[PDB]
Amino acid sequence: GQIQVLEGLEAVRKRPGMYIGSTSERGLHHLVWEIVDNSIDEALAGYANQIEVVIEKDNWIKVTDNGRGIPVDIQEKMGRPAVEVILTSSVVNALSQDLEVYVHRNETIYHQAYKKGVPQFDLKEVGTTDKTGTVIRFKADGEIFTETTVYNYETLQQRIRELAFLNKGIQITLRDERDEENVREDSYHYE
């Protein structure tokens, strides 16, 4: 089970272009689409209706949704929490130098961090909450994306606007916090 996980990460890092199209600027932006697509699926299942994408200092990406939260129940097949199985099978996690998740579920905040898809510690209870949803924060691996790891605000804006237009009823917000002195936000919500 666990051995099959490591080979999966190795495979994605060995031929990243086969999984995200390219290691150019295009492939870097794809990382955001892959995570946002998971939030959109949770909205289409009837659970979520708000997605926030933040470009943080040093081109971290934070994606937050108000869905049910990725499940944390032990996956009888792997003996690992479901969220760990799901994120260790993620292309984005494989192609990130660092990735962390916060799940709000069962009135609890759970946290796990990864490097190149490898968990750095067991899923941990870190707090309490009266909300549900998922926070993903990731830093693209510069060893993979050798051209640029800098996000283009207008590229992300055009695609987020498109996703809000195609998926009516979902509020999707993009915020650029890289320059703390000039913060830019665009928020889209069709019908």
Q: Is residue 47 close enough to count as binding Cl ion by CB under 5 A? A: no
Q: Exposure of 49 by Cβ count < 10 A (0-12 exposed, 13-18 middle, 19+ buried)?
A: middle
Closest separation in Å from C-beta 44 to ligand N1N: 11
Residue 54 interaction partner, one of Cl ion, ligand N1N, none, beta carbon < 5-8 Å per kind: none
What character string, x for contact with ligand N1N (CB under 6 A) and - otherwise, covers 77-96? -----x---x----------
What character string, x for contact with ligand N1N (CB under 6 A) and - otherwise, covers 35-64? x--xx--x--------------------x-
Write the CB contacts of 77 (distance below 8 Å, at least 6 apart in sequence): 1, 85
Give the integer Cα–Cα distance in Å for 90 and 136: 12
Residue 68 interaction partner, one of ligand N1N, Cl ion, none, beta carbon < 5-8 Å per kind: ligand N1N
Token representation of residue 52: 């926030």
What character string, x for contact with Cl ion (CB under 5 A) and - otherwise, covers 49-88? ----------------------xxx---------------
- 72: how many CB neighbours lie within 10 A of its CB? 19
Give the integer Cα–Cα distance in Å for 72 and 67: 14
Give the integer Cα–Cα distance in Å for 55 and 104: 21
Identified binder of ligand N1N from the candidate list 67, 81, 117, 119, rule CB under 6 A: 67
